[PDB]
């Protein structure tokens, strides 16, 4: 019966999860973490990724 | 033994380093520093880099498991490679910084609310550890009035009587 | 050493069974708790065909039953059901000769020896033990596996121990990926008499070796009980495949169960 | 500066974001892999021709 509420809550959480998981996507970059690119590639090369 | 240094024996050792396109088998002693807990540090455990606060943990890691991940797929816990102990990693604290201010036409005295931060990481007279965060420059008052400037978590601040900002 | 030649060579016919729901192992070394996590890697699909045979460790009686050379593919799930430790090791490679580098893993009475060399494996690798009546204990005294071993590329010997010379099920997963030979192991007491047991048990990682060689075939190594003159051990083999699995880490982090997504529509929903 | 105005009315304004930087760096590795036998060469009682 409480679904109307619970449902809503889930959606919120769901969105956040998706958002957080979008931190782990390459989007075409060599890696999905900025620190690795900064530590490996020089700014002239790193900036494109 | 009585020959000149030119004719005396000399033991010679030549160290050559064979570097092929194969996994390396010989390396040097890594410089492992001391462990620091309960302080925002830039840590690197066995090549796994990160930034956060290391705290003693009660998690029951299995003997072979090293890191502890979560739904976020971020390292929540680690195993200290030298001393086999489990450390929880917490992201270094942060949060919004809001300013509770009565109208400048009224006064220029303000209070600062660091939302969602404990009153220990604020460099910081009066301090209040409200559930909404650390409030600085606000005088906690037991008396309850009508909400004037809604801070949050049931706490509201107002400019009132010499006058000052009171959080109630 | 010097190979021992057997005039008569034979191999028992293969048999087939169902994998049920075994072959699940921890993909990485990341701890987790009370969480359902999806991982895409080489796993043993549930209810897959499993090719199994028997290993004769005693003759009684001049016929040499030699184990067969089996392909490796992308990895092998090898199970052994036995009372005593009959299965002792394996050999991996492509040509299994001195032409190409070959790996050899063994667990003798002393310790575990893992050597990657240009081995020249014998036709019928032989491990022979004899019963010391005075000492009332078996002692290994024959090891004729490879005729030669040249240009060794890897060697690792574990610490010495004593192996004891209600069944035991020893499951192993061998995966050669990115030049790394990963071995995962599990040991359980199984009361079943015959057939691959039906149940669930995660396989903990054992060791990763950066041998960096090519493997396409492997063969099993058994122990021979020399006697002055029936309960032969059995073993099963399955081939892993690229699959997606939903693993359920419980409070302690032990994988309590797993679901094979591509097994059936219900698992796809799960 | 957040509101771009000289006059600020009563209320609470999200001005900035407070973040804590790392005080120092911690590096820990498994302290012993093995121990190369260089002494067997240098401290050998007898050397070869
Ligand atoms: C290296 O780590 C091991 C692991 O417990 C420890 O026993 C040993 O004392 C350590 N050695 C040094 C020099 O700290
Ligand atoms: C300041 O506010 C008071 C009432 O709160 C008002 O009477 C006064 O005119 C205001 N001053 C200015 C400069 O607007
Ligand atoms: C802030 O830290 C102290 C000690 O670490 C703790 O007792 C207190 O509960 C913390 N603040 C909040 C709001 O939990
Ligand atoms: C508010 O009252 C509580 C008990 O009722 C007391 O402990 C606390 O010190 C009071 N605070 C102030 C600012 O007087
Ligand atoms: C395994 O393969 C054999 C023939 O290759 C077949 O007869 C048998 O039914 C298969 N196993 C299963 C469980 O279908
Ligand atoms: C072993 O290596 C040497 C030099 O790397 C080579 O001359 C020799 O042929 C190799 N062994 C075999 C069996 O080819
Ligand atoms: C976790 O391990 C502890 C100690 O090994 C044991 O007492 C407990 O029952 C275990 N719990 C689960 C859920 O496996």
UniProtKB/Swiss-Prot annotation, chain B:
<feature type="glycosylation site" description="N-linked (GlcNAc...) (complex) asparagine; by host">
    <location>
        <position position="142"/>
    </location>
</feature>
<feature type="glycosylation site" description="O-linked (GlcNAc...) threonine; by host GALNT1">
    <location>
        <position position="161"/>
    </location>
</feature>
<comment type="subunit">
    <text>Binds to host ACE2. RBD also interacts with the N-linked glycan on 'Asn-90' of ACE2. Cleavage of S generates a polybasic C-terminal sequence on S1 that binds to host Neuropilin-1 (NRP1) and Neuropilin-2 (NRP2) receptors. Interacts with host integrin alpha-5/beta-1 (ITGA5:ITGB1) and with ACE2 in complex with integrin alpha-5/beta-1 (ITGA5:ITGB1). May interact via cytoplasmic c-terminus with M protein. May interact (via N-terminus) with host bilirubin and biliverdin, thereby preventing antibody binding to the SARS-CoV-2 spike NTD via an allosteric mechanism.</text>
</comment>
<feature type="glycosylation site" description="N-linked (GlcNAc...) (hybrid) asparagine; by host">
    <location>
        <position position="105"/>
    </location>
</feature>
<feature type="disulfide bond">
    <location>
        <begin position="147"/>
        <end position="156"/>
    </location>
</feature>
<feature type="disulfide bond">
    <location>
        <begin position="40"/>
        <end position="92"/>
    </location>
</feature>
<protein>
    <recommendedName>
        <fullName>Spike protein S1</fullName>
    </recommendedName>
</protein>
<feature type="disulfide bond">
    <location>
        <begin position="119"/>
        <end position="134"/>
    </location>
</feature>
<feature type="region of interest" description="Disordered">
    <location>
        <begin position="21"/>
        <end position="43"/>
    </location>
</feature>
<comment type="function">
    <text>Attaches the virion to the cell membrane by interacting with host receptor, initiating the infection. The major receptor is host ACE2. When S2/S2' has been cleaved, binding to the receptor triggers direct fusion at the cell membrane. When S2/S2' has not been cleaved, binding to the receptor results in internalization of the virus by endocytosis using host TFRC and GRM2 and leading to fusion of the virion membrane with the host endosomal membrane. Alternatively, may use NRP1/NRP2 and integrin as entry receptors.</text>
</comment>
<feature type="glycosylation site" description="N-linked (GlcNAc...) (complex) asparagine; by host">
    <location>
        <position position="118"/>
    </location>
</feature>
Swiss-Prot record, chain C:
<feature type="domain" description="BetaCoV S1-NTD">
    <location>
        <begin position="2"/>
        <end position="270"/>
    </location>
</feature>
<feature type="glycosylation site" description="N-linked (GlcNAc...) (complex) asparagine; by host">
    <location>
        <position position="151"/>
    </location>
</feature>
<feature type="glycosylation site" description="N-linked (GlcNAc...) (hybrid) asparagine; by host">
    <location>
        <position position="108"/>
    </location>
</feature>
<feature type="disulfide bond">
    <location>
        <begin position="3"/>
        <end position="122"/>
    </location>
</feature>
<feature type="glycosylation site" description="N-linked (GlcNAc...) (complex) asparagine; by host">
    <location>
        <position position="5"/>
    </location>
</feature>
<feature type="region of interest" description="Putative superantigen; may bind T-cell receptor alpha/TRAC">
    <location>
        <begin position="250"/>
        <end position="270"/>
    </location>
</feature>
<feature type="glycosylation site" description="N-linked (GlcNAc...) (high mannose) asparagine; by host">
    <location>
        <position position="214"/>
    </location>
</feature>
<protein>
    <recommendedName>
        <fullName>Spike protein S1</fullName>
    </recommendedName>
</protein>
<feature type="glycosylation site" description="N-linked (GlcNAc...) (complex) asparagine; by host">
    <location>
        <position position="135"/>
    </location>
</feature>
<comment type="function">
    <text>Attaches the virion to the cell membrane by interacting with host receptor, initiating the infection. The major receptor is host ACE2. When S2/S2' has been cleaved, binding to the receptor triggers direct fusion at the cell membrane. When S2/S2' has not been cleaved, binding to the receptor results in internalization of the virus by endocytosis using host TFRC and GRM2 and leading to fusion of the virion membrane with the host endosomal membrane. Alternatively, may use NRP1/NRP2 and integrin as entry receptors.</text>
</comment>
<feature type="region of interest" description="Disordered">
    <location>
        <begin position="128"/>
        <end position="150"/>
    </location>
</feature>
<feature type="disulfide bond">
    <location>
        <begin position="117"/>
        <end position="152"/>
    </location>
</feature>
<comment type="subunit">
    <text>Binds to host ACE2. RBD also interacts with the N-linked glycan on 'Asn-90' of ACE2. Cleavage of S generates a polybasic C-terminal sequence on S1 that binds to host Neuropilin-1 (NRP1) and Neuropilin-2 (NRP2) receptors. Interacts with host integrin alpha-5/beta-1 (ITGA5:ITGB1) and with ACE2 in complex with integrin alpha-5/beta-1 (ITGA5:ITGB1). May interact via cytoplasmic c-terminus with M protein. May interact (via N-terminus) with host bilirubin and biliverdin, thereby preventing antibody binding to the SARS-CoV-2 spike NTD via an allosteric mechanism.</text>
</comment>
<feature type="glycosylation site" description="N-linked (GlcNAc...) (hybrid) asparagine; by host">
    <location>
        <position position="49"/>
    </location>
</feature>
<feature type="region of interest" description="Disordered">
    <location>
        <begin position="55"/>
        <end position="66"/>
    </location>
</feature>
<feature type="glycosylation site" description="N-linked (GlcNAc...) (complex) asparagine; by host">
    <location>
        <position position="252"/>
    </location>
</feature>
């Amino acid at each position: 019966a409480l679904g109307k509420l619970q449902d809503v809550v889930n959606q919120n959480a769901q969105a956040l999860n998706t958002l957080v998981k979008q931190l782990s996507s390459n989007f075409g970059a060599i890696s999905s973490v900025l620190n690795d690119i900064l530590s490996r590639l020089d700014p002239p090369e790193a900036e494109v990724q | 033994p009585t020959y000149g240094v030119g004719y005396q024996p000399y033991r010679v050792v030549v160290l050559s380093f064979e570097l092929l396109h194969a996994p390396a088998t010989v390396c040097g002693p890594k410089k492992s520093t001391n462990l620091v807990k309960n302080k925002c540090v830039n840590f690197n455990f066995n090549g796994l880099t990160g930034t956060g606060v290391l705290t003693e943990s009660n998690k029951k890691f299995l003997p072979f498991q090293q890191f502890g991940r979560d739904i976020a797929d971020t390292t929540d816990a680690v195993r200290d490679p030298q001393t086999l102990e489990i450390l929880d990693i917490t992201p270094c604290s942060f949060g919004g910084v809001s300013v509770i201010t009565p109208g400048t036409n009224t006064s220029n005295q303000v209070a600062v609310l660091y939302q969602g931060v404990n009153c220990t990481e604020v460099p910081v007279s009066n301090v209040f550890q409200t559930r909404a965060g650390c409030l600085i420059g606000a005088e906690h008052v037991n008396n309850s009035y009508e909400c004037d400037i809604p801070i949050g978590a049931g706490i509201c601040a107002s400019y009132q009587t010499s006058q000052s900002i009171i959080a109630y | 050493s010097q190979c021992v030649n057997f005039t008569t060579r034979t191999q028992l016919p293969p048999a087939y069974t169902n994998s049920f729901t075994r072959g699940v192992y921890y993909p990485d070394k990341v701890f987790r708790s009370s969480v359902l996590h999806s991982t895409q890697d080489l796993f043993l699909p549930f209810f897959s065909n499993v090719t199994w045979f028997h290993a004769i460790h005693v003759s009684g009686g001049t016929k040499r039953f030699a184990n067969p050379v089996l392909p490796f593919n992308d990895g092998v799930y090898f199970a052994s059901t036995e009372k005593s430790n009959i299965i002792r090791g394996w050999i991996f490679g492509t040509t299994l000769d001195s032409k190409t580098q070959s790996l050899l893993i063994v667990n003798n009475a002393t310790n575990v020896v893992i050597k990657v060399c240009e081995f020249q494996f014998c036709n019928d690798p032989f491990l022979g033990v004899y019963y010391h009546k005075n000492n009332k204990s078996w002692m290994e005294s024959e090891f004729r596996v490879y005729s030669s071993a040249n240009n060794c590329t890897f060697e690792y010997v574990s610490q010495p121990f004593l192996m004891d010379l209600f069944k035991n099920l020893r499951e192993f997963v061998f995966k050669n990926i990115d030049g790394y030979f990963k071995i995962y192991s599990k040991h359980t007491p199984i009361n079943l008499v015959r057939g691959l047991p039906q149940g669930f048990s995660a396989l903990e990682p054992l060791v990763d070796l950066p041998i960096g060689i090519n493997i396409t075939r492997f063969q099993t190594l058994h122990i021979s009980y020399l006697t002055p003159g029936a309960g032969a051990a059995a073993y099963y083999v399955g081939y892993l495949q690229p699959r997606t699995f939903l693993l359920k880490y419980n409070e302690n982090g032990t994988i309590t169960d797993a679901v094979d997504c591509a097994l059936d529509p219900l698992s796809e929903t799960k | 500066c957040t509101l771009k105005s000289f006059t600020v009315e009563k209320g609470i304004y999200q001005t900035s974001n407070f973040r804590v930087q790392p005080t120092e760096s911690i590096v820990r590795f498994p302290n012993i892999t093995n121990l190369c036998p260089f002494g067997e060469v240098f401290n050998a009682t007898r050397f070869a021709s």
